[PDB]
């Protein structure tokens, strides 16, 4: 009965304030209570606070009293979470959820990065193997981008389940990740295999055909 | 306050083959108090499973102070971290979460080595990549005959075949890369008594 769409990822400087949005759609939307969760990279979920869109009731985690301000905009069916006095400890994934007795939906998460570093596009480098078997594993390397998230598809998503995208790793203040696609060697290099890299932070989308040599 | 505590932090069962959550404040003391159990698959939002109120594949058990999620049977899709949560007008709170692992027969890693792109070489750098893919268990070690500038990255247990895959990278300057010739990536896994190795000349 309800579906939720959070705003895009974000890079902001310490000591400013963001507002992230959650656009609801569905039936009987004031019947759902909106709330917000923080998930730090590889950490557990912590509740931020709630807002009852029908009556305006709100209740916050003590730790975010003062920090976070939840509002809803019944007109545009949008919940907001405003965050002040931002620091590096705040950067994490922020979910928005809605629920009642009958069902419950979460949003897709919003990656927020607090840093005074500037955005850095990825370096997308193809990985072709050397010189035997029906399967051939290709790859693609995205080198030194900031911040994270980054979206990596193969052939615009036409290749899946043959994929292994590896969690980016922080080395020298930057992220780098690799992803392996495996296909029949019947198919490659006859059929053109392409790496797709979206870095929404640096508003970047690059395709790199893998080529045989 | 309200403290949610769940045992165990880490779990590991095989296909075909319970998690407890204990509140410090009972659900029954508030008029509209709720307990939830969530499944979080990796790189996904958490999804609601079961709920309990005050006054099929998965089931909730226990007393009004212990909401017990019980998965039976375990599919390979059930690989995730599981969270319990308590609801009332004063606060929401979540448990620590419990990581679920699938038990599978040990598997040979499929190793493939890769040389620097010409695009990275014209940039002035050179990176050597080794995918070890689809190997059980997670335990694995990797290494002209350096250990500096290496970067590794594991994957979570696969949801289809209950497997792990690892990526490693050895990185040099343009000029330092040609100072050597044979580059061999050595894969020390448990099951293969021989250390699976692959190399390239140029
Ligand atoms: Cl560092």
C-alpha distance from B162 to closest chain A C-alpha (Å): 13
Taking the CB of residue A108, how many other CB atoms lie within 10 A of it? 13
Q: Same domain for A40 and A105?
A: yes
Task: Give the CA radius of gyration of chain B.
Answer: 23
- A36-43 own/partner pairs: CB under 8 Å, 24+ apart: A36/A68, A36/A70, A36/A81, A36/A94, A36/A95, A36/A96, A36/A97, A37/A94, A37/A95, A37/A97, A37/B94, A38/A92, A38/A93, A38/A94, A39/A92, A39/A93, A39/A94, A39/A95, A39/A109, A40/A92, A40/A93, A41/A92, A41/A93, A43/A92
Based on the domain organization, do A11 and A108 belong to the same domain? yes
Cα separation of the two ends of chain B = 64
> How far from B19 is each of A43, A143, B98, CA to CA, in Å?
19, 40, 8
Task: Name the domain boundary from B55, B86, B103.
Answer: B103
Q: What is the per-residue burial (b if ≥16 Cβ within 10 Å, else e) of B107-128?
A: bebbbbbbbbbeebbeeebbbb
Give me A104's structure tokens. 């419950």
Asked if residue A85 and residue A171 are part of one domain, the reply reads no
Question: How many Cβ atoms from other residues are within 10 Å of residue A190's Cβ?
Answer: 9
Q: Which of B61, B88, B103 is the last residue of a domain?
A: B103
Tell how strand B98-103 and strand B10-14 pair up: parallel
Cα–Cα dist B60/A80, whole Å: 33
Instruction: Give me the residue from A95, A125, A130 closest to B119, CB to CB.
Output: A125
CA distance B35 to B85: 5
Number of folded domains that form chain A: 2
Q: How far apart (Å, rounded) are the C-alpha atoms in residues A10 and A46?
A: 20
- Optimal mutation site among A1, A3, A127, interface B, most CBs of chain B within 10 A: A127
Same domain, B68 and B47: yes
For B68, other C-beta atoms within 10 Å of its C-beta total: 18
Asked if residue A172 and residue A93 are part of one domain, the reply reads no
Q: Tell me which residue range forms the domain holding A57.
A: 2-114
B65 with B83, same domain? Answer: yes
Tell me which residue range forms the domain holding B60. 4-103
Residues B166, B104, B70: CA angle, nearest 5 degrees: 110
Resolution of the solved structure (Å): 2.6
Q: Are B27 and B114 part of one and the same domain?
A: no
Sequence-distant contacts of A152-155: CB under 8 A, at least 24 apart: A152/A177, A152/A179, A152/A195, A152/A196, A152/A197, A152/A198, A153/A196, A153/A198, A154/A179, A154/A181, A154/A193, A154/A194, A154/A195, A154/A196, A155/A193, A155/A194, A155/A196
**Contact indicator for A61, A82 with CB cutoff of 8 Å:** no
Residues A92 and A185 in one domain: no
- Buried-state track B73-96, b at ≥16 Cβ within 10 A, e below 16: ebebebbbbbbbbbbbeebbbbbe
- Same domain assignment for residues B153 and B191: yes
Judgement on whether residues A20 and A61 belong to the same structural domain of the protein = yes
Q: Are residues A142 and A77 in the same domain?
A: no
Q: Is A167–B160 a contact, with Cβ atoms under 8 angstroms apart? A: no
Question: Would you tell me which residues 96-155 of chain B have a C-beta closer than 8 angstroms to some C-beta of chain A?
Answer: 96-97, 110, 112-117, 119-120, 123, 125, 127, 129, 131, 133, 151-155
CA distance A128 to B115: 7
- Name the residue in chain B with its Cα closest to that of A169: B153
Residue with tokens 């038990």: B103
Tell whether A98 and A152 lie within a shared domain.
Answer: no
Q: Which of B40, B117, B201 to mutate to test the interface with A (most CBs of A within 10 A)?
A: B117
Q: Domain check: are A84 and A129 in the same one?
A: no
Q: What is the CATH number of the domain that holds A50?
A: 2.60.40.10
**CA dist., res. B118 & res. B115, Å (int):** 9
Asked whether residue B117 falls in the same domain as residue B67, the answer is no
Residues near A190 by beta carbon (within 8 Å), at least 6 away in sequence = none
Instruction: List CB contacts of B42: < 8 A, sequence separation 6 or more.
Output: B80, B156
Q: Are residues A56 and A92 in the same domain?
A: yes
User: Which secondary-structure segment (H or E) carries B120?
Assistant: helix B118-123
- Asked whether the beta carbons of residue B131 and residue A37 sit closer than 8 angstroms, the reply is no
Looking at the fold, whether B125 and B61 belong to one and the same domain comes out as no
Token output for A193: 């295999």
Query: Which of A126, A166, A177 is nearest residue B117 as measured by Cβ atoms?
Result: A126
Where among B50, B74, B103 does a domain terminate?
A: B103
Please tell me whether residues A151 and A168 are part of one structural domain.
yes
Query: For the domain that residue B40 is a member of, what is the CATH number?
Result: 2.60.40.10
Please say whether the beta carbons of A58 and A69 come within 8 A. Answer: no
Same-domain check for residues B79 and B138: no
**A125 close contact with B: CB closer than 8 A:** yes
DSSP state of A157: G
Instruction: Please tell me the total number of residues recorded for chain B in this structure.
Output: 202
Smallest CA–CA distance from A136 into chain B, residue: B112
Considering the domain architecture, whether residues B177 and B126 belong to the same structural domain is answered as yes
Reference B69, options B20, B36, B3, B15; nearest CA is: B20
Phi and psi, residue A100, nearest 5°: -150, -165
B48 and B95 together in one domain: yes
Q: How far is CA A178 from the centre of its chain?
A: 17
Q: How many CB pairs under 8 A join A and B?
A: 110
Task: Residue A40: count other Cβ atoms within 10 Å of its Cβ.
Answer: 13
**Residue of chain B whose Cα is closest to the Cα of A63:** B91
Q: What DSSP string runs through B32-69?
A: T-EEEEEEE-TTS-EEEEEEEE----EEEES-TTEEEE
Q: Do A45 and B89 make contact, defined as CB atoms within 8 angstroms?
A: no
**Number of structural domains, chain B?**
2
3-state secondary structure of B5: strand
């Amino acid at each position: 009965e309800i579906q939720l769409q959070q705003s895009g990822p974000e890079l902001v400087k310490p000591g400013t304030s963001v507002k992230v949005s959650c656009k609801a759609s569905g039936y009987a939307l004031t019947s759902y209570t909106m709330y917000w969760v923080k998930q730090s990279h590889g950490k557990s979920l912590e509740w931020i606070g709630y807002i009852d869109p029908y009556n305006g009731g709100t209740s916050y985690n003590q730790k975010f009293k003062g920090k976070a301000t939840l509002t809803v905009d019944k007109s545009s069916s949008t919940a907001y979470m405003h965050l002040n006095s931002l620091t590096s400890e705040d950067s994490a994934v922020y979910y928005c959820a809605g629920w009642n007795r009958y069902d419950e939906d979460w949003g897709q998460g919003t990656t927020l990065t607090v840093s005074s570093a500037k955005t850095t596009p990825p370096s997308v480098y193809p990985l072709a193997p050397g010189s035997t078997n029906s399967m051939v594993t290709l790859g693609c390397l995205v080198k030194g981008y900031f911040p994270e998230p980054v979206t990596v598809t193969w052939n615009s998503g036409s290749l899946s389940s043959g994929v292994h995208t590896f969690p980016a790793v922080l080395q020298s203040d930057l992220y780098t990740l690799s992803s392996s696609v495996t296909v029949p060697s019947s198919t490659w290099p006859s059929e053109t295999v392409t790496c797709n890299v979206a870095h929404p932070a640096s508003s970047t989308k690059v395709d790199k055909k893998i080529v045989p040599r | 306050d309200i403290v949610l505590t769940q045992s165990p932090a880490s779990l590991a069962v095989s296909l075909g083959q319970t998690i407890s959550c204990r509140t410090s404040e009972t659900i029954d003391s508030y008029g509209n108090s709720f307990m939830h159990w969530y499944q979080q698959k990796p790189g996904q939002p958490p999804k609601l499973l079961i709920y309990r109120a005050s006054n099929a594949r998965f089931s909730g058990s226990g007393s009004r102070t212990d909401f017990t999620l019980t998965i039976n049977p375990v599919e390979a899709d059930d690989v995730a971290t599981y969270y319990c949560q308590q609801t009332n007008e004063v606060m929401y709170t979540f448990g620590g979460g419990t990581k679920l692992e699938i038990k599978r027969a040990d598997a040979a890693p499929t190793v493939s080595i890769f040389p620097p792109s010409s695009e990275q070489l014209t940039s002035g750098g050179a990176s050597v990549v080794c995918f070890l893919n689809n190997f059980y268990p997670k335990d694995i070690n990797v290494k002209d005959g350096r250990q500096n500038g290496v970067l590794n990255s594991w994957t979570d247990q696969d949801s289809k075949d209950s497997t792990y895959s690892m990526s490693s990278t050895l990185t040099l300057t343009k000029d330092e890369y040609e100072r050597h010739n044979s580059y061999t990536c050595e894969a020390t896994h448990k099951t293969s008594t021989s250390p699976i190795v692959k190399s390239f000349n140029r």
